[PDB]
């Protein structure tokens, strides 16, 4: 029944909790710094939520934005060697969503793809949305639907748990044109 201030009180939290509860809150706390939501381990930026979009605009100029709830994410050059990243932004319902495609090295020459959407917003806000990722090919279709992650949470855990759209190179070839992959992204509200 002794109460401790949140470690992010200096940033404005005002929550005080029993030690039993302290870390569980501090992991979820809105006043926790946001890390750069871009894929890969190159950018080490951190800041508040309101600083994220300007950051992305200053430091990640190549990232393109599309307005609309229903768009096509065309990842080019998917067979180009290494582990690689694709990222773009989708604007709708008064929010920005980051679309990420990530290629990883798996067991042998075989590689795996992970595709996922994050909300540029809080976890609570993230709960109001759903997204759908669609791969389309000749007489085929692969679909993944879920709740977007808040960038507060990030995608490392989701991707690690296959909690996103997961497919490997052979799957990729079925849906690819040239060396490019079209991903249909549809956002909706719950």
């Amino acid at each position: 029944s002794v109460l401790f201030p949140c470690k992010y009180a200096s940033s404005g939290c005002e929550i005080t909790l029993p030690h039993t509860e302290k870390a569980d809150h501090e992991e979820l706390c809105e006043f926790r710094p946001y890390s750069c939501p871009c894929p890969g381990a190159s950018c080490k930026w951190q800041g508040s939520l309101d600083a994220v979009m300007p950051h992305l605009m200053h430091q990640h100029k190549s990232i393109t934005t599309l307005q609309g709830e229903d768009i096509v994410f065309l990842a080019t050059d998917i067979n180009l060697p290494g582990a690689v990243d694709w990222v773009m932004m989708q604007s709708c319902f008064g929010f920005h969503f980051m679309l990420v495609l990530e290629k990883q090295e798996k067991y042998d020459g075989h590689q795996q793809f992970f595709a996922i959407v994050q909300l540029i917003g809080t976890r609570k806000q993230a709960e109001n949305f759903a997204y759908r990722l669609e791969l389309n090919g000749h007489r085929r279709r692969l679909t993944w639907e879920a709740t977007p992650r808040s960038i507060h949470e990030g995608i490392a855990t989701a991707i690690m748990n296959s909690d996103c759209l997961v497919f490997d190179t052979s799957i990729a070839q079925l849906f690819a044109e040239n060396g490019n992959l079209g991903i249909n992204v549809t956002i909706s509200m719950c």
Partner: peptide, 10 residues
């Protein structure tokens, strides 16, 4: 419902 060519991060 448009499309966007996205190149690898680099």
């Amino acid at each position: 419902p448009k499309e966007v060519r996205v190149e690898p991060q680099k």
